Amino acid sequence: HLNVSKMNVDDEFKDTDGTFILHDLQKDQTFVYNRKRANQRQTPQSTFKVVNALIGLQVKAVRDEYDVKRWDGVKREFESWNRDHTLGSAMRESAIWYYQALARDIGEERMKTWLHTLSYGNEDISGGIDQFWLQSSLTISPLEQETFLEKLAKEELPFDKPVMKIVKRMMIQEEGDHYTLYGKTGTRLTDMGLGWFVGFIKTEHGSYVFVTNVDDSGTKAKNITVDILKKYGLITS
C-alpha cells in the first residue's frame, strides 16, 4: 500500500540531473523529486504527440489509431520511420514526420485555440506549425505536464470520451497480469540532452500519473521511470 509522500528516488537518478513526479489518483497525493526543475518550462519534444493526437482526432484531421499516411520515400535517420505509418504506430515509434503532417492539417489557428483551451505550457507555436514542439518555441514544465495528464487519466479534458480512450490505448507500453504501463517518450534528438517519459500506470489498486524529465535521452527517462515503478511495487508482473 504505497504512500507516495514517503518515497525516495535519489538513487534512480544516479549521474543524471532530472525531476520526477508521481501522482496517486485514488489518494490524491503527489510526490516530487527536484521541485525546482519540476517548475522549469522545457520544450516537450515528442511528448507533444499525446496532445497532437487528441486534437487531431477531435477535429477529425485523422480518423483513428489506424489512419494510414504513406511514407514519401525520404530516408530519415531511423529505419523505423522509413515505412508507412499510422497515428498509433507513429506515436509508438516517434515518427515525427507523421505528426508534422497532422499538425499541418490541424493548422496554426486551430492549434493555437486548442493550446489555449488546454492551458498547455506557454502555448507558443511561433516556431512554426510543424516545428514548434521540437526544441523550438513551445515549452511546458514537468508539473504542467502532470496537470494535463491527470486530466487525461480522469477523462476531464474537453475531448470526446472515445478520443481519449484511443489515445490512452496508443500510449500502452507494457501489460502485465497486474498492471498496464502507459507512456510517451520525448528526446531532443540533436544532442540527446533533454529527455522525457510521461504517462500513467494502472494497477489493481488504482492509477498513478508520472512525469520524468532529465538532461539525457527519452530512453534514459523511461529507464529511470521503470526502475522507480519497480522499486515501489507498481510494475510487478
Closest CA to 3 of 205, 181, 225, 224: 205
Identity of the residue, 124 or 215, whose beta carbon is nearer to Ca ion in the bound complex = 215
Quote the least distance from Cβ 132 to Ca ion, whole Å: 28
186 among annotated binding-site residues? yes
Q: How far is the CB of 14 from Ca ion (least distance, A)?
A: 8
Which one of 9-17, 82-90, 105-113, 147-155 is the stretch in contact with Ca ion (CB under 5 A)? 9-17
Q: How far out from the chain centre does Cα 213 lie?
A: 11
What sign results for the dihedral spanned by CA atoms 194, 209, 138, 49? positive
User: Which entry of 5, 46, 136, 137 is annotated as an active-site residue?
Assistant: 46
Taking the complex as a whole, how short is the minimal distance between the CB of residue 216 and Ca ion, in angstroms? 6
On whether the CB atoms of residues 213 and 37 are closer than 8 A, the answer is yes
Nearest CB to Ca ion, comparing residues 166 and 226: 226
Interface residue with Ca ion among 11, 77, 177, 204 (CB under 5 A) is: 11
The residue number whose beta carbon is nearest to Ca ion equals 11
- Minimum Å gap between C-beta 90 and Ca ion is 30
Q: What are phi and psi of 162, to 5 degrees?
A: -60, -30
Q: How many residues bind Ca ion (CB under 5 A)?
A: 2
Residue 224: all three cell numbers together: 529511470
The span of 5-13, 37-45, 58-66, 201-209 binding Ca ion (CB under 5 A) equals 5-13
* 77 near Ca ion, judged by CB under 5 A: no
Nearest residue (CB) to Ca ion, 166 versus 229: 229
Among 1, 6, 10, 15, binds Ca ion (CB under 5 A): 15
Alpha-carbon distance 45 to 47, whole Å?
5
- State the amino acid at position 128 in one-letter form: G
C-alpha cell recorded at residue 194 = 533533454
Q: Is 99 helix (H, G, I), strand (E, B) or coil?
A: helix
Active site residue 5: no
Copy the grid coordinates of residue 125.
507555436
Using left for φ > 0, alpha for ψ between -120 and 50, and beta otherwise, residue 230 falls in alpha
Largest interatomic CA distance in the chain? 52
Least Å distance, CB 19 to Ca ion, is 14
Lookup result for grid cell 486548442 = 114
Q: Is 184 annotated as a binding residue?
A: yes
Phi and psi for 83 in degrees, rounded to 5? -165, 165
Can you say which residues are annotated as belonging to the binding site? 184-186
As annotated, the active-site residues are 46
Can you say which residues are annotated as belonging to the binding site for substrate? 184-186
Q: Which residues bind Ca ion (CB under 5 A)?
A: 11, 15
